[PDB]
Structures are given as structure tokens and as C-alpha cells.
Design a protein around this ligand. Structure first.
Ligand code: HEM
Ligand code: V55
Length: 403
């Protein structure tokens, strides 16, 4: 509807999935808050606007249309008030820093070693499928109580939920343009139910130290549990983003380091720099790139746009993390970038609950990788492609090393 942005009418969903950075560079300059027709929503592209919307008292949580179609209610990312307070209290115990420090090393390090031992003497590997994704899902899967669900299956589930959650394209009338793209999300949920319903049956009668068992029991009156239908949407939140994003983050960090071979050498030589390398990695390609949204609760003015009450705004944190008002040459990976705040974990009341855990998973995984393969190099015979608008990461990461 905005005349000078008529070019946005020609932006396609495929373009945003393959490479959103050119469109979003224009948005950050022309319209930090803009309606994108193919997404059917206002989008916030700059750090100032994302931060304001995510922390404003005049906005509250909502799920995107395709996200809500995929997860239903009450997904922790999309609720407010008393329900959100309860779901936050439910997930937070195992994520508390002092608790994570008690067991994170004994959890992740043996998992990383197990997967590394399968290929560390081959001289070649595709690290997304052989290392980054397995370590991410096996670590969280064991924490949750899903020890008997294979990492192949956890990876398949987050991939299907990813595509369903981000099936956001809409047509002229604002209707989903690809309604059949939700079917594999529905099929993944059906499989998850078949596996998890018996585990919940068991945990209700025999609680244990698994996180989902504690979700059922913690804070409840004696003999009561949270109803499974009340917690399943937050289980899906985990089985998508919590399973996927640490693997995305460590892979993007590696791609970034490979693009700066001098900096990769530094980090291999001095592993205490791995946390700094990961933080730049998350800024450089944010795993949660534009998955979330807020909705206005009152009429509000943002970036010169007068929004009525009830207006959704998508939070494109991955674009915000390339805001040239903050960073110099943000499209380049730079380990020695001055440490600044970033928005890869969001902001406000709905900011990431698992930051401390996620950073440790990524750190320990990179530590063990660089120890087992110090002469790791990227297979330049292959190129690295990134995919995703809602969630973004490399689709593969071929490497080689002298055995
Ligand atoms: C590098 C890995 C990760 C990244 C980049 C990431 C990023 C984010 C982002 C951007 C949000 C939305 C924040 C907002 O809307 O302002 C979020 C929400 C959330 N994340 Fe993380 N995440 C990561 C890993 C994890 C892990 C491993 C867990 C659990 C163990 C987790 C648990 C959560 C939860 C529960 C929420 C919802 C918070 C709420 O709505 O109140 N995250 N995360
Ligand atoms: C932490 O996992 C999730 C986070 C988000 C944030 O927008 C969306 C879907 C997810 O599964």
C-alpha cells in the first residue's frame, strides 16, 4: 500500500529463503518497519525497531500465522500473562546457570567425542549432518528425557517443523499460498505424539530427573501434573528451535572462521577464544533469523508508521544483526569485532530462555572438534550455501584434513 515501496510487491518467498540480505539491506535503509506483501505482515529490520518492539509495553507475544498453524496453543513463544509466567517457570529450572554448570560438561563432551570418533580419521566429513546437528539434538534430547529417540529422528523432526513453521507465503487475499506445506508438520507432530505419549504416561506415575518429567510435576499440587495438551506446544518449540539452533550456530561460526583463515588458526591455537567466535557467528548469521513476532495491544507509532491495535510485527533479528548503524562491514565475519550487544537471542520478556545452555553446547562441541582435528580445513572444491528466512544456517559444511 506504501507507494515508494511498490518494489516489495515483487519480492518472493524463494528469494527470502535463499538470500534475504539484499532485500533487508534495502528495508533497513528505506523502511525499518515495512509491510512485506508475500509475508502478509509488517517486518522490523533494524536493531532499534526490533529492540523497541520486543521490549515495548504496547506489544505482546504472538506467533506468526504459519507458526501458529504448526504449534497451536499455548506455545511459550506466543502467549502472555499468567500462562506465559507458568510456562517460563516450567522450563527455567534446568536452564539456570548454576544448574547447567553442574552437568553440562559430562553431558556434551562424551556426546561430541562419540560422534567425532565416527569420522575423525577419515580426512573428510560433512559436519552439519555428521557433527553439528547430532551433537545439538543428542545433548538436548538426553536432557529432555528422549534418550531412546535417535538423533537421525530428532533431526528429521526439526527439519519438518522448520519447513511448516516457516511456510509463511501468502497470496493476494492474505491466504496461505502453499497450504500443503503444513502436512509434513502435521505428520511430524503425529510421530512425536506416538513416541512421547508413552513417556509422559510413565513420567506421570514414575517421575525422574528428565526435563519433561519436571515440566509435568514441578510446582503442581500433590498428585497433580500439567495436562499433556498444555505442554505439548512447548515441547514442539523445543523440538524445532532448541534442537536446531545450537547446531546452526556452531556451523555458521565454523563457516565464518573458515572465511578468515588467520582467525581460525588463532582459535584453534587458543580455545579460550571459542566463546568470542560463537558470539560473532550468531551475529553474522543468526540461527533464529526472522521466526518470531509481536502484536500491538494499543495504537502505537514505530519508525514513523502509525500502527493500529492488533497489528503483528515480525522480528527479523538476523537483519538487525547486520545493522550498519551498529556494525562496520557486518556481512564479514570478524572474530576481533568490538564486542557489542546483539539480538540473536532476542530481547524482552520473551528473550531466549536457554542462552547459557546453548552457548555451552556450542563451546564444548567446537572445543572437542578443534582438539580432534587441529588441521581442519574447508573443502573448497565445495561451496557453502545457506538456506532459510525464519531459521537460517548452512545446508552442508564439507571439510578435509591431512590424516
Ligand atoms: C544458538 C542457539 C539458540 C538461539 C540463537 C536461540 C534464539 C532464540 C530467540 C531469538 C528466541 C526468541 C526471542 C524473542 O522472541 O525475542 C528464543 C526463544 C526461546 N528459546 Fe532460544 N535459541 C537457541 C537455543 C535454545 C535452546 C538450546 C533452548 C532450550 C534448551 C532454547 C529455549 C528457548 C525458549 C524456551 C524460548 C522461548 C522464550 C519465551 O518465549 O519466553 N533456546 N531463542
Ligand atoms: C526456541 O525454539 C523456538 C524459538 C522461536 C523464536 O521465535 C520460534 C520457534 C521455536 O521452536
Amino acid at each position: 500500500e506504501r507507494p515508494d515501496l511498490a518494489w516489495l510487491d515483487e519480492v518472493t518467498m524463494t528469494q527470502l529463503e535463499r538470500n534475504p540480505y539484499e532485500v533487508y539491506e534495502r528495508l533497513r535503509a528505506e523502511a525499518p518497519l515495512a509491510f512485506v506483501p508475500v509475508l502478509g505482515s509488517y517486518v522490523a529490520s533494524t536493531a532499534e525497531v526490533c529492540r523497541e518492539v520486543a521490549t515495548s509495553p504496547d506489544f505482546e507475544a504472538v506467533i506468526t500465522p504459519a507458526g501458529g498453524r504448526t504449534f497451536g496453543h499455548p506455545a511459550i513463544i506466543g502467549v502472555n500473562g499468567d500462562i506465559h509466567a507458568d510456562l517460563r517457570s516450567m522450563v527455567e529450572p534446568a536452564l539456570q546457570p548454576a544448574e547447567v554448570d553442574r552437568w553440562i560438561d559430562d553431558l556434551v563432551r562424551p556426546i561430541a567425542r562419540r560422534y567425532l570418533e565416527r569420522f575423525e580419521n577419515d580426512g573428510h566429513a560433512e559436519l552439519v549432518a555428521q557433527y553439528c546437528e547430532p551433537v545439538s539434538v543428542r545433548s538436548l534430547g538426553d536432557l529432555l528425557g528422549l534418550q531412546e529417540v535417535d538423533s537421525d529422528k530428532l533431526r528429521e523432526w526439526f527439519a519438518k517443523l522448520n519447513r511448516s513453521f516457516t511456510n509463511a507465503a501468502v497470496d493476494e487475499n492474505g491466504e496461505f499460498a502453499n497450504p500443503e506445506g503444513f502436512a509434513e508438520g502435521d505428520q511430524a507432530k503425529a510421530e512425536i505424539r506416538a513416541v512421547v505419549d508413552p513417556l509422559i504416561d510413565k513420567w506421570i506415575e514414575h517421575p525422574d530427573d528428565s526435563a519433561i518429567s519436571h515440566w509435568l510435576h514441578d510446582g503442581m499440587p500433590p498428585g497433580q501434573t500439567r495436562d499433556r495438551e498444555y505442554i505439548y506446544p512447548t515441547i514442539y518449540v523445543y523440538l524445532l528451535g532448541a534442537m536446531q539452533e545450537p547446531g546452526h550456530g556452531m556451523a555458521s561460526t565454523l563457516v565464518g572462521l573458515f572465511s578468515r583463515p588467520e582467525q581460525l588458526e588463532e582459535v584453534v591455537d587458543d580455545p579460550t577464544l571459542i566463546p568470542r567466535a560463537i558470539a560473532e557467528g550468531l551475529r553474522w548469521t543468526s540461527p533464529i533469523w526472522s521466526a518470531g513476532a509481536r502484536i500491538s495491544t494499543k495504537p502505537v507509532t514505530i519508525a514513523g508508521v502509525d500502527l493500529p491495535a492488533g497489528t503483528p510485527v515480525m522480528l527479523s533479528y538476523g537483519s538487525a544483526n547486520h545493522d550498519t548503524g551498529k556494525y562496520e562491514a557486518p556481512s564479514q565475519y570478524d572474530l576481533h569485532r568490538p564486542p557489542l550487544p546483539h539480538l540473536a537471542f532476542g530481547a524482552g520478556n520473551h528473550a531466549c530462555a536457554g542462552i547459557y545452555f546453548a552457548n555451552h553446547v556450542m563451546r564444548i562441541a567446537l572445543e572437542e572438534l578443534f582438539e580432534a582435528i587441529p588441521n581442519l580445513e574447508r573443502d573448497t572444491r565445495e561451496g557453502v550455501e545457506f538456506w532459510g528466512w525464519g531459521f537460517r544456517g548452512p545446508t552442508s559444511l564439507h571439510v578435509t584434513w591431512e590424516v
